[PDB]
Amino acid sequence: QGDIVVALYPYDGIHPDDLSFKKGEKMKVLEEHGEWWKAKSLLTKKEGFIPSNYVAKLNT
């Protein structure tokens, strides 16, 4: 369903809905499409689209 990923670099909140995340930050994926998955910021429940490049899976 929703896997957990960690940001390797800050995203860049440019869109009004994009979820901003920083490097080393942990995020929860809810629906990974094919290039931009919408994760949730553990900071305080932030939900926004995250790029499939900045963040990486907890594994590799």
């Binding site: 094919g34 290039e35 689209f49």
Partner: peptide, 22 residues
């Protein structure tokens, strides 16, 4: 080291994926 501030380019967003809602 020296810099300490990396950041790869993001994806393109299929049909405004990470852009707007749908």
């Amino acid at each position: 080291w020296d810099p300490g501030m990396p950041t790869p380019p993001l994806p393109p967003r299929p049909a405004n994926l990470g852009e707007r809602q749908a």
